[PDB]
Every structure is written in C-alpha cells, then in structure tokens.
Amino acid sequence: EARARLLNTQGKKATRKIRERMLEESKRIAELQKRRELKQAGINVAIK
RNA sequence: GUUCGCGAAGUAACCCUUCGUGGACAUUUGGUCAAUUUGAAACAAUACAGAGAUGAUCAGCAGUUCCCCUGCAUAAGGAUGAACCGUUUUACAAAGAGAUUUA
Numbered sequence: 001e002a003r004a005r006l007l008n009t010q011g012k013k014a015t016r017k018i019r020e021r022m023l024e025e026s027k028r029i030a031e032l033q034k035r036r037e038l039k040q041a042g043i044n045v046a047i048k
Numbered sequence: 049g050u051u052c053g054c055g056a057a058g059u060a061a062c063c064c065u066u067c068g069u070g071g072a073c074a075u076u077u078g079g080u081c082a083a084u085u086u087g088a089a090a091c092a093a094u095a096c097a098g099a100g101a102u103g104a105u106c107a108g109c110a111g112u113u114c115c116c117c118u119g120c121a122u123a124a125g126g127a128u129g130a131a132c133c134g135u136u137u138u139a140c141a142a143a144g145a146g147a148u149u150u151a
C-alpha cells in the first residue's frame with residue numbers, strides 16, 4: 001500500500017490532465033486513419 | 049399667392065371688373081441606415097463525464113494571460129472563475145591516459 005503510495009506525486013488534477021491529453025491523442029490517431037482510409041478510396045476530406 | 053405700380057379694354061367719371069406686363073415679398077429637405085434565408089446573439093437538448101492544494105474531505109486570498117462572465121462599481125462573486133500542472137542538451141573549457149595519421 002505505502003510502497004505504491006509514495007510513487008505518485010501529483011494529485012487528482014494532474015492525473016486528470018494526463019488522461020485528457022492522451023484521449024486527445026487517440027482522437028487524433030482515429031481522425032487520421034479516418035483520413036488515411038478515405039485516401040485509400042481517393043476521396044480527400046479536409047481536416048477541421 | 050399677397051401686395052405696389054404701369055399699360056390696355058370694359059364699368060365708369062378717376063372708380064368696380066378683366067387681360068397683359070414690371071417690381072417686391074417667399075429660396076435647396078434627408079441618408080454611416082434597402083424589405084426575413086447567403087456578413088454573423090447566446091442558451092437549451094443528446095452523448096461523454098461530473099469540484100486545487102492531500103493518503104482523504106473542505107475554508108480560502110493571491111500571482112501571469114493576445115480568456116473573460118454577472119455586477120452601478122476602484123465592492124464582491126463566477127469550482128479559491130477558467131487557462132497554469134506539460135515538453136526540456138552548446139558562453140563550454142582545462143589537465144592526464146591509450147589507439148590512429150603525419151612533418
């Protein structure tokens with residue numbers, strides 16, 4: 001319990017940020033391979 | 049349209065009427081702006097969650113910003129208002145030791 005406790009220094013807010021940011025990156029990757037597979041159909045859809 | 053005056057005609061007896069003409073009086077509004085889709089309100093609803101300092105549950109003041117919102121406000125609130133929490137290499141040298149090349 002303690003040996004696990006010491007190792008995280010931040011507090012709820014920072015961790016919350018780590019998540020939010022990664023979720024943004026999943027959004028990016030997804031939207032990309034959206035556009036990639038649409039290029040494999042040749043139809044070119046512009047990014048927002 | 050008024051008035052002054054002239055001329056003409058008629059009525060007349062110096063006038064009443066009609067015609068013509070001269071003169072004066074009176075003298076430049078408004079527009080940054082066309083009448084609903086295509087020159088710009090903002091909320092709400094759906095889904096996703098669902099409140100900083102900590103191991104945890106709360107009071108809070110601040111600080112910076114090419115973010116502001118409510119408020120008459122130089123008051124005070126808006127999660128202590130929100131954003132901050134991340135990515136990170138060179139004024140660069142001196143001494144010593146081994147390998148390589150050359151005068």
Ligand SMILES: [Mg+2]
Nearest residue numbers: 124125128129
């Ligand atoms: Mg305040």
Ligand SMILES: [Mg+2]
Nearest residue numbers: 099106127128
């Ligand atoms: Mg609080």
Ligand SMILES: [Mg+2]
Nearest residue numbers: 110128129130
């Ligand atoms: Mg504040």
